[PDB]
Amino acid sequence: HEDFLKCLSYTVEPKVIHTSKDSSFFSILDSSIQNPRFSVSETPKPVSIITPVKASDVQTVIRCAQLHGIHVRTRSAGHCYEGLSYIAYNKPFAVIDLRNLRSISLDVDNRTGWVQTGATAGELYYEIGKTTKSLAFPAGIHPTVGVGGQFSGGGYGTLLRKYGLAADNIIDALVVDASGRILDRQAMGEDYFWAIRGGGGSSFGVILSWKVKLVDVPSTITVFKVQKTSKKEAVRIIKKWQYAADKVPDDLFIRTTLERSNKNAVHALFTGLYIGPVNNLLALMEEKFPELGLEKEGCEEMSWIESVLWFADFPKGESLGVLTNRERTSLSFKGKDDFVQEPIPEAAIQEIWRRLEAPEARLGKIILTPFGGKMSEMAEYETPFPHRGGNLYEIQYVAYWREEEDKNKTETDKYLKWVDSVYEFMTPYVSKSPRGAYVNFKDMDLGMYLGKKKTKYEEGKSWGVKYFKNNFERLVRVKTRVDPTDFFCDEQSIPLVN
Ligand SMILES: *Cc1cc2c(cc1C)nc1c(=O)[nH]c(=O)nc-1n2C[C@H](O)[C@H](O)[C@H](O)COP(=O)(O)OP(=O)(O)OC[C@H]1O[C@@H](n2cnc3c(N)ncnc32)[C@H](O)[C@@H]1O
Ligand SMILES: [Cl-]
């Protein structure tokens, strides 16, 4: 690692290379940890962090690492559910933090833009929304999530039924491969270009930039919220949502969240985004979902960019500038998810409601996100993300807790157990053989490389088919061509072929 450091100085700037002796080290590392439970002293620390400022720096890191046997991890904005962008287990590593490469240059008239991978979804949103009210981009709702990790793993949000995933809307890209070669879509090839758009970027290289396709939105859209605190009534409505939500027009997004209310009781929160006017939303909802009981008072017409702040839980009429904040979260979490292919029984709905009444589920959520629309229109093979037609909705079980509590691992166990238990309960009701999982919600509990099988291929196949289903074999083929040394690897990365 010593020579490695020297190798970097042979130009890669001195003051973008951090090690433990640098006063500005634990701060650089701690800054973009967006799951605080993985910021504890007992978790593995890197022996160096590099914050590149030009592409050439990244190249040098890739080339020098391989030359001196140094393992790396790449961080954009650090929302990895298991912290695998700044944690490597059982072998010393360094971190390529992309915080300095976040330049966003749009071409609003040609509906494209280049987005450097250090940028957050919020920054991208801000750049678009401040410039034009008639364009958008389909990514997640949480502004501090980086485009690096999110886009390379798929990326859904309130426009998925209309426009699909973020990865479904990328038309070129720059990646540094195991050589240190900077490759655009033309230079990298279609197989490479495919793999990086959902396959999990940590398996394929260092993605430097995305070329996005901007999508059209009306200057006026409509959001709505309906709250149901009565279990009986809410369970009734959720049953109906299960049949309606994935079949409504592409313009209508209806999410169901089960969680605590301010009055410390379980409720069902139905929130949505309609790509059109309020009267059209209302007529559509009495037709397809009159059980929700939506009325004008539950609705609000605003711009799409304003709907971003809305879904991101900011005060109404807040300045768009909050999209640009990259502040550290204070809530640790454990998340798992599932895909539902046919409506779960009323009995299932009541039980998962019941489990949220648990004391340790006070900051927990069960979130039901409707697919259908563009999501069933697109075929499995089109991008590595496999969960298309046949999936009614995706469901995430996530428990949050205050980072203070992390001081006693034994105490935060109850949250893990909570999340594990509801997931186990849901087994008979969700997809099976394989049980589908979303790679942007990384879960070591589905399996990791430890030495269970002879080769990495047979061991990695285990969780591989859960994340990627029938797309797993292609990813492995692409992986074998583009990265035959297997330089880019973590605890769940795509394996080389046998
Ligand atoms: C933190 C979070 C995440 C999240 C969410 C809510 C919160 C609080 N809700 C989501 C949702 O509603 N919909 C959705 O699609 N995703 C949601 N997530 C998950 C989030 O998208 C993923 O965690 C995403 O992968 C995180 O991306 P980010 O860039 O912020 O995180 P990272 O730790 O730095 O990276 C994660 C993995 O990707 C690799 N990576 C990152 N950058 C690159 C580049 N440029 N090249 C190659 N690989 C890259 C990391 O190595 C890591 O494995
Ligand atoms: Cl998100």
Rounded to an integer in angstroms, the radius of gyration calculated over CA atoms is 22 Å
DSSP helix fraction: 25-40%
Q: Kindly report the CATH topology of the largest domain.
A: Uridine Diphospho-n-acetylenolpyruvylglucosamine Reductase, domain 3
Count of structural domains: 3
Quickly give the structural class: alpha+beta
| CATH top level class name of the largest domain | Alpha Beta
- What CATH architecture label of the largest domain applies? 2-Layer Sandwich
Keywords: Cell wall, Disulfide bond, FAD, Flavoprotein, Glycoprotein, Nucleotide-binding, Oxidoreductase, Secreted, Signal
Enzyme class: oxidoreductase
EC number: 1.1.1.-
Family: Belongs to the oxygen-dependent FAD-linked oxidoreductase family.
Topology of helices and strands:
Layout: H1 2-9, E1 17-18, H2 26-31, E2 48-50, H3 55-68, E3 71-75, E4 93-97, E5 104-107, E6 112-116, H4 121-131, E7 135-136, H5 147-152, H6 160-163, E8 170-176, E9 182-183, H7 185-188, H8 190-195, E10 206-213, E11 215-216, E12 221-228, H9 231-244, E13 252-260, E14 266-274, H10 278-288, E15 299-302, H11 304-311, E16 331-340, H12 346-356, E17 364-370, H13 374-377, E18 393-402, H14 409-426, H15 456-468, H16 472-482
Parallel strand pairs: 2-4, 3-4
Antiparallel strand pairs: 1-2, 5-6, 6-10, 7-11, 8-9, 8-10, 12-14, 12-15, 13-14, 13-17, 16-18, 17-18
This protein binds flavin-adenine dinucleotide (FAD) and chloride ion (CL).
Flavin-adenine dinucleotide is lined by residues 34, 73-81, 84-85, 98, 117, 140-142, 145-146, 148-150, 152-153, 155-156, 201-202, 206-207, 440, 490.
PDB class: oxidoreductase
Keywords: covalent FAD binding, berberine bridge enzyme like, plant enzyme, oxidoreductase
Assembly: monomeric
